[PDB]
Design a binder for this molecule. Structure first.
Ligand SMILES: N#Cc1ccnc(N2CCCCC2)c1
Length: 209
């Protein structure tokens, strides 16, 4: 059973801007997704201080980067707090509406796309390099879900039947045909060292078989 939803008009507009603006510094997508993972890990860590049972779904707090050349995907996995169905459909979009309006105002005033994370909508920088994004996520209070969008104004949510995750989020970037440099180990290593060197959780870059 697959549900299809329309993005808010403002978020659809943000996604088209990211897809259509000429902007060569695409590598910042990875900084933004790792930053989101670090924030989700911070959240479950803080909650566990007053309720240790919140880590019954997994004690390890980490980020994995998994390239796959056969599938042309780059996957960012974290064992953070995860997202509920309400997060995926309503809550994040509500917050993202005001962040988007501020980001667009900043751009017309001379800011550039690399400052997107200051406005809370850094996730959508994934569309700098991905033609489709799939998000698998599991929050302690809800079921495991799969969110998906190729932009175009809509996204889907379904209950995920795949491998159970325990807790956290997997962002699967289906890369554009001309963005396969982000599957190469040396390139990912370079980007992590440049933009994510002080993240306070272990980042493991998997290597391809
Ligand atoms: N602004 C914004 C924002 C921040 C974090 N995550 C999201 N997401 C990704 C999961 C499903 C769609 C919404 C949006």
């Amino acid at each position: 059973e697959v549900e299809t939803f329309a993005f808010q008009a403002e978020i659809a507009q943000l996604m088209s801007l990211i897809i259509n603006t000429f902007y060569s510094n695409k590598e910042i997508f990875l900084r933004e997704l790792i930053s989101n993972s670090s924030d989700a890990l911070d959240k479950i860590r803080y909650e566990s201080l007053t309720d240790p049972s919140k880590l019954d779904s997994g004690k390890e707090l980490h980020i994995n980067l998994i390239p796959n050349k056969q599938d042309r995907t780059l996957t960012i996995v974290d064992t953070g707090i995860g997202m509920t169905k309400a997060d995926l459909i309503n809550n994040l979009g509500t917050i993202a509406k005001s962040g988007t309006k501020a980001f667009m105002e900043a751009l017309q005033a001379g800011a550039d796309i690399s400052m997107i994370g200051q406005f809370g909508v850094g996730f959508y920088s994934a569309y700098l390099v991905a033609e489709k994004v799939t998000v698998i996520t599991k929050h302690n209070d809800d079921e495991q879900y799969a969110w998906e969008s190729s932009a175009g104004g809509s996204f889907t949510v379904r209950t995920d039947t795949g491998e159970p995750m325990g807790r956290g989020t997997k962002v699967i970037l289906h890369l554009k045909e001309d963005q396969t440099e982000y599957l190469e180990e040396r390139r990912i290593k370079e980007i992590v060292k440049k933009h994510s060197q002080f993240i306070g959780y272990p980042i493991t870059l998997f290597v391809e078989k």
